[PDB]
């Protein structure tokens, strides 16, 4: 659903606007990840995955 940066409720298509365009009523999944880029480890926020 909502992000951790903007902290708005959601930005979304309404379902009845979605059910007549053959689309899927969806909200994206967000994760936060940390890893070794190189010289050092960094953490990254709000990655889209699905």
């Amino acid at each position: 659903g909502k992000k951790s940066s903007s902290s708005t409720k959601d930005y979304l298509t309404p379902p009845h606007e979605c059910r007549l365009r053959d689309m899927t009523y969806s909200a994206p999944i967000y994760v936060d990840i940390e890893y070794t880029r190189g010289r050092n480890i960094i953490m990254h926020k709000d990655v889209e995955i699905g």
């Binding site: 890893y35 880029r37 190189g38 990655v47 889209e48 995955i49």
Partner: protein, 50 residues
């Protein structure tokens, strides 16, 4: 399997970032879930059940 295919290079070892090839694997969750509701049959693996 996309990581070590990149990391099997001698020059490509220092400033490489791995996050730029996450969008190619992103929609496998989406297109898996959408046909999992559309066509009512579930191909599980840890139970192998249909």
């Amino acid at each position: 399997l996309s990581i070590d295919k990149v990391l099997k290079k001698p020059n490509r070892a220092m400033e490489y970032d791995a996050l730029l090839s996450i969008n190619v694997h992103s929609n496998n969750i989406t297109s898996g879930l959408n046909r999992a509701i559309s066509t009512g049959n579930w191909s599980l693996k840890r139970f192998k059940m249909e």
